[PDB]
Design a protein around this nucleic acid. Structure first.
Ligand SMILES: [K+]
Ligand SMILES: [K+]
Ligand SMILES: [Mg+2]
Ligand SMILES: [Mg+2]
Ligand SMILES: [Mg+2]
Ligand SMILES: [Mg+2]
Ligand SMILES: [Mg+2]
Ligand SMILES: [Mg+2]
Ligand SMILES: [Mg+2]
Ligand SMILES: [Mg+2]
Ligand SMILES: [Mg+2]
Ligand SMILES: [Mg+2]
Ligand SMILES: [Mg+2]
Ligand SMILES: [Mg+2]
Ligand SMILES: [Mg+2]
Ligand SMILES: [Mg+2]
Ligand SMILES: [Mg+2]
Ligand SMILES: [Mg+2]
Ligand SMILES: [Mg+2]
Ligand SMILES: [Mg+2]
Ligand SMILES: [Mg+2]
Ligand SMILES: [Mg+2]
Ligand SMILES: [Mg+2]
Ligand SMILES: [Mg+2]
Ligand SMILES: [Mg+2]
Ligand SMILES: [Mg+2]
Ligand SMILES: [Mg+2]
Ligand SMILES: [Mg+2]
Ligand SMILES: [Mg+2]
Ligand SMILES: [Mg+2]
Ligand SMILES: [Mg+2]
Ligand SMILES: [Mg+2]
Ligand SMILES: [Mg+2]
Ligand SMILES: [Mg+2]
Lengths: 89, 122, 74, 81, 134
RNA sequence: GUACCUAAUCAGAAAGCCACGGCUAACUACGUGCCAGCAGCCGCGGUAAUACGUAGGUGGCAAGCGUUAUCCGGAAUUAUU
RNA sequence: GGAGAGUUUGAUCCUGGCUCAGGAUGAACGCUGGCGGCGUGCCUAAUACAUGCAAGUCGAGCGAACGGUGUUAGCGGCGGACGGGUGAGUAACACGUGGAUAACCUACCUAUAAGACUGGGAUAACUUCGGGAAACCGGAGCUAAUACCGGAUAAUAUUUUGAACCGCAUGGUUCAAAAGUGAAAGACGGUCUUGCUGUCACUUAUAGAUGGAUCCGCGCUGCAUUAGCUAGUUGGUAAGGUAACGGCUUACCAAGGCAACGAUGCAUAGCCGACCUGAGAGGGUGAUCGGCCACACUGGAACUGAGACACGGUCCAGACUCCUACGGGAGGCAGCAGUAGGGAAUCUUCCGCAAUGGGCGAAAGCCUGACGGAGCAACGCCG
RNA sequence: UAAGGAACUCGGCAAAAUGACCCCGUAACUUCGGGAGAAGGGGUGCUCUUAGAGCCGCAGUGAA
């Protein structure tokens, strides 16, 4: 299936994550469909979430499913609330 | 029934393919040899890369014959071809594999390694 | 819909589509030609006629084009 | 061979192959019988065609043949009917 | 030439040749074939050590005959004052031809494999395989 | 119990490699006597060697420094430019 | 953003080669060696491989057994076609770039709609009797299901009647309007009324998304001291075949097709983004990271499946290795480590699923040598 | 005529083997004609249909 997930970048002990839409079978750091943001869990003060809200809802409405961590990221940006509100309405 | 100038297939992987019988060993005036007998032979045809080469004079034990052999119970065994195995003085095979069936008389001849490596012993 | 590639050429057996391949190093244009085996339906065209062709699905082992229009008669 | 699930897959493959062989054979028999019955205008050429169409559709549902092959087989009988 | 001549027959650069051809070949024993690998050194066995006279120069220059690991025979120079080599010695051979010695295109590495370092050397020791004294 | 931080003690454990005739930065002495050896090229050594070997000094680099192999450059030495 | 020098002569100016000063590396070797960070580390034998680990999961699909609510082997579902390795083959639509499909397929996911009715019979497990050193194989009975199989209902799918409109030729989008034909399943809960109902699961249809397939333009190494190549070959008709067009296959008919714009043959080579060098134009390379392809001891097949002609599946043939009680059996590190060998030369038979990602599961979770880390090496860069 | 197959002999002497027709395919060398039937391989019976399908034997130019 199509996933919204985190691909690892950065260096040893210093992880940086891009938020990508990718086929489940694609290797973690390989072929993607579309990048929709970034995520930096080791930042100084705030985890530095940078999600493209219009792109995230297009893929969510197209059947793409987030991983557990990406679901928390999208929730912290209110994308999950807008997805649920737009589905019922 | 193997005599001087009889050509024999080699039933091992030692390199020799066909040998020509030079002498039947085991006494003055001995003319013929059969399964389990030792012959002096020369390698007329060899395969590439084998330990035994064409033109070598070697010793071999006869392991099957068209004449075959008669057993004490009045039964007989005969084969479709004459085949031998190149041996050392210790009666061990020079090659590391044996092809085709060999006669059980080799066991009485004490060619136990050949008997063990044979795929069938009849 | 969508557009299929169109060529213009001369029949060499009853289509030659001579084009230019500019030299990679020296910049001079060199003429080169490629023969396009094409489907003429009712054997209408003949040798030397200048014809228009359009790309199609494979029609045989080597035929990928259909003769649409004859431009200059033999 | 070596892996436990690979060893189990050998058994389930053989079970599916036996069922698939039977159903393919029966479906091919009915198609051939319906094909012959058309080429002679038998009284029950309609029943034999309907049976062949029934079995070809069941094979496509079972993924024994593709739906495209079932449609191609269905037309060959029905145009000749 | 003309542009049209160059289009018909393009330029061709001279092919460079190697000064140490015996180093740039391997040998696959199983397939009995020669490879091309560009090694920096090659192991070998001394077939015949000895001396040879130079081409204006005059000396008795020490050398060895070596069968390399790729079954190629070469003449290799033995640098430094005194050596411990003889027949059946296992030596490491590097590139570098010695002028005034025709037919010697390689050097033996001092202090590698069976070749010893030069005895008593104190300057430029790493070129002659000699450990640091004291 | 890693990074990191805090306190105590001690210059104490922690410098080598190549080169120095010209190209090319950096020279003297002794030994050797076309020998032993050096060498990328020019070439050096046959009794006063800045080129061999060692020593002192110097130069270039430095946890590296040299050698070999390989590729591009220098090469306008395949030249479209 | 572009530097020269030495060397042919008694001396000269040319021509001309040679050599040197620069940069770089998966380097190796010699001497030497303090540390930290980040990276990199079999280029050779696609040589052969001891040992361990690298793919399972689900008891909320099912029966049984053993234990005191748990678990084991089995049936069943999904996964095992991903992820990981390697570059042998390949000069080709393999790859790059740009297009086409009115000649295509698509599990799991998402959305919408309509459904999910009614019967049946097996069989592993198991018990028992055997046969074999083993691997394992037979006889007798036994039994369940979201396993399997009948029947009913369901059409947009097929045939025929046509029609309207449109396209790039074959054609395509609707409008019908008759004839055949095709499904499904329960589990765990709530309320209780045994009726309704939640979640997950199931069927059909249509879209989307994803992934895959085919075709075409241009681009792609040497050798002409390689000039002829092809006879399913090239085209046609028909049938068969495929997801699909097609000599894809066959039958018959015709004699075409390719080539000096280099066919064909031989040799070499996985290709690209990139990387090194260079003022640039160019020249050189494909280790590491990413995309695509190909391969899995060698060769040939097919099965299951949405997807394979399948690295840790099957069948067959071969080479080789191993067990045997001689009847018979077993195996495939180009997964991660590691061994032997070859070599100038390239590492630990380590820790953990805490993070990211993947499979299964309602979930808890389980599995994951992917991966995240640690170990060894001045191999490189920086401090 | 078992098994062997030139070990016979001055020497394969003698004998054995080959042999027809039809179709594939054919080297060094060459005076370009040749070498050549080079070599080496495939098929032959009978019945039926109009190249297929069958039938029989150890064997089908079943003898010479
Ligand atoms: K001079
Ligand atoms: K994990
Ligand atoms: Mg935090
Ligand atoms: Mg100076
Ligand atoms: Mg020196
Ligand atoms: Mg002096
Ligand atoms: Mg000097
Ligand atoms: Mg000196
Ligand atoms: Mg430093
Ligand atoms: Mg160069
Ligand atoms: Mg150059
Ligand atoms: Mg590191
Ligand atoms: Mg390798
Ligand atoms: Mg192997
Ligand atoms: Mg279980
Ligand atoms: Mg489904
Ligand atoms: Mg079912
Ligand atoms: Mg290759
Ligand atoms: Mg330049
Ligand atoms: Mg299938
Ligand atoms: Mg597999
Ligand atoms: Mg494996
Ligand atoms: Mg390994
Ligand atoms: Mg070794
Ligand atoms: Mg996870
Ligand atoms: Mg495990
Ligand atoms: Mg080192
Ligand atoms: Mg006889
Ligand atoms: Mg006889
Ligand atoms: Mg004979
Ligand atoms: Mg004689
Ligand atoms: Mg005699
Ligand atoms: Mg005669
Ligand atoms: Mg005759």
């Amino acid at each position: 299936a199509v996933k919204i997930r985190l691909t690892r970048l950065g260096s040893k002990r210093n992880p940086f994550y891009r938020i990508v839409v990718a086929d489940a079978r694609s290797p973690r750091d390989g072929r993607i469909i579309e990048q929709i943001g970034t995520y930096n869990p080791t930042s100084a003060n705030a985890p530095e979430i940078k999600v493209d809200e219009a792109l995230a809802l297009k893929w969510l409405n197209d059947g793409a499913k987030p991983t557990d961590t990406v679901h928390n990221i999208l929730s912290k940006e209110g994308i999950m609330k807008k997805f649920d509100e737009q589905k019922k309405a | 029934m193997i005599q001087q100038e009889t050509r024999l297939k080699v039933a091992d992987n030692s390199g020799a393919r066909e040998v020509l019988t030079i002498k039947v060993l085991g006494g003055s005036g001995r003319k013929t040899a059969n399964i389990g007998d030792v012959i002096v032979c020369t390698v007329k045809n060899a395969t590439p890369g084998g330990v035994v080469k064409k033109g070598d004079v070697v010793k071999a034990v006869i392991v099957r014959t068209k004449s075959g052999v008669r057993r004490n119970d009045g039964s007989y065994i005969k084969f479709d071809e004459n085949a031998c195995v190149i041996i050392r003085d210790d009666k061990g095979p020079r090659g590391t594999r044996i092809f085709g069936p060999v006669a059980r008389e080799l066991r009485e001849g004490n060619f136990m390694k050949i008997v063990s490596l044979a795929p069938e012993v009849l | 819909r969508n557009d299929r590639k169109v060529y213009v050429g001369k029949v060499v057996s009853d289509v030659l589509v001579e084009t230019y391949k500019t030299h990679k190093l020296y910049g001079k244009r060199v003429k080169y030609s490629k023969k396009y085996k094409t489907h003429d339906e009712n054997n209408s065209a003949k040798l030397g006629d200048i014809v228009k062709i359009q790309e199609t699905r494979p029609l045989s082992a080597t035929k990928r084009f259909r003769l649409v229009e004859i431009v200059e008669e033999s | 061979a070596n892996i436990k699930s690979a060893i189990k897959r050998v058994k389930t493959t053989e079970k599916a192959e036996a069922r698939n062989i039977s159903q393919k054979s029966a479906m091919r028999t009915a198609v051939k019988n319906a094909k012959t019955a058309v080429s002679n205008n038998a009284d029950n050429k309609n029943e034999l065609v309907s049976l062949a169409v029934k079995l070809v559709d069941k094979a496509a549902q079972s993924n024994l043949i593709h739906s495209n092959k079932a449609d191609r087989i269905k037309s060959q009988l029905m145009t000749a009917n | 030439p003309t542009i049209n001549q160059l289009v018909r027959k393009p330029r061709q650069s001279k092919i460079k040749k190697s000064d140490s051809p015996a180093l740039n070949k391997g040998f696959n024993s199983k397939k009995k074939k020669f490879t091309d690998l560009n090694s920096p050194q090659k192991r070998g066995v001394c077939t015949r050590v000895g001396t040879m006279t130079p081409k204006p120069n005059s000396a008795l220059r020490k050398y060895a005959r070596v069968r390399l690991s790729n079954n190629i025979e070469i003449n290799a120079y033995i640098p430094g004052i005194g050596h411990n080599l003889q027949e059946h010695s296992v030596v490491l051979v590097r590139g570098g031809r010695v002028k005034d010695l025709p037919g010697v295109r390689y050097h033996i590495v001092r202090g590698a494999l069976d070749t010893s370092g030069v005895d008593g050397r104190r300057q430029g020791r790493s070129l002659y395989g000699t450990k640091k004294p004291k």
